[PDB]
């Protein structure tokens, strides 16, 4: 699983819980929208 | 309904209430003007 379209609109906390459940090793980075990466 | 020109100038709270009434599933994202999407 590489994408989480079910998380659009949800909080960071709920996104993190869902991602770590699907992907235990995930390194979760939180950035404002529009941030150049 | 895809657009809400009646909400220009209104608060986020009033925009949200109106949008969710017209579109129950809406996932409401709030960004500063000028944000690149």
């Amino acid at each position: 699983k590489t994408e989480w379209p079910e998380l659009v609109g949800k909080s960071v906390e709920e996104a993190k819980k869902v991602i770590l459940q699907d992907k235990p090793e995930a390194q979760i980075i939180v950035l404002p929208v529009g941030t150049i990466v | 309904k895809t657009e809400w020109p009646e909400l220009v100038g209104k608060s986020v709270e009033e925009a949200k209430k109106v949008i969710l009434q017209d579109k129950p599933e809406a996932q409401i994202i709030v960004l500063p003007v000028g944000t690149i999407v």
Binding site: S11, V12 | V30
Partner: peptide
């Protein structure tokens, strides 16, 4: 492209604004 990383792009209320993807 980093397979263990997941970026969360958040709005002004810290809600997820875009679909999260590995990378």
């Amino acid at each position: 492209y980093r397979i263990d990383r997941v970026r969360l792009f958040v709005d002004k209320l810290d809600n997820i604004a875009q679909v999260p993807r590995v990378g």
